[PDB]
Amino acid sequence: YDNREIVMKYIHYKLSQRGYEWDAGDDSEVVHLTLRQAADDFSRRYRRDFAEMSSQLHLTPFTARGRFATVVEELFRDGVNWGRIVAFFEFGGVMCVESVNREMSPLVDNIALWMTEYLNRHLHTWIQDNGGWDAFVELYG
Numbered sequence: 001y002d003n004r005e006i007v008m009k010y011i012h013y014k015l016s017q018r019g020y021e022w023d024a025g026d027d028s029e030v031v032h033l034t035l036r037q038a039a040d041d042f043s044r045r046y047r048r049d050f051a052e053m054s055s056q057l058h059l060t061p062f063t064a065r066g067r068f069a070t071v072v073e074e075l076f077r078d079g080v081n082w083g084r085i086v087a088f089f090e091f092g093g094v095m096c097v098e099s100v101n102r103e104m105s106p107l108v109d110n111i112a113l114w115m116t117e118y119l120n121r122h123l124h125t126w127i128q129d130n131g132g133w134d135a136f137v138e139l140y141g
């Protein structure tokens, strides 16, 4: 599977669903559909967390990378599982929405890059060794 495509299709779905434009996301698919529905379910179960995160990020172009790294380290500090990976995608979405809300749309390209590099380097071994995206689809698809 393709981590860049998974990130691109997720961020495009989340932003387009809420009326936000991301030019670079303008457009195997059972993975995208499964992640979409898992993420939407996560968002519904933890709306209060979705709301507190959006209201406190306080992004600027120079602090965006540090805010992303700080949250993602805390998310995986106790270990990785599929639910924390889904939460990682939803947090990336929140970062992208808040970037546009604060007139920093170019930051969406950076956030998508950071998310991809994170799957490619930090989370890669865990995802592969726990069955890859195919296991994720079999468990939650």
Ligand SMILES: CC1(C)CCC(CN2CCN(c3ccc(C(=O)NS(=O)(=O)c4ccc(NCC5CCOCC5)c([N+](=O)[O-])c4)c(Oc4cnc5[nH]ccc5c4)c3)CC2)=C(c2ccc(Cl)cc2)C1
Binding pocket: 037, 038, 039, 041, 042, 045, 046, 049, 050, 053, 071, 074, 075, 081, 082, 083, 084, 086, 087, 088, 090, 091, 094, 140
């Ligand atoms: C600084 C911070 C670190 C502070 C903390 C927080 C917020 N926290 C993050 C961690 N969190 C977690 C973590 C793990 C799990 C879990 O059970 N893990 S699990 O057992 O592996 C699994 C279990 C079920 C499914 N799927 C169900 C299917 C049912 C049928 O429909 C399809 C889906 C999956 N799965 O992967 O799909 C995997 C979980 O519970 C659930 C429950 N329901 C879920 N539905 C989808 C995912 C999911 C997880 C919730 C709780 C909220 C921060 C925060 C804030 C805002 C944003 Cl925006 C983000 C983060 C920041």
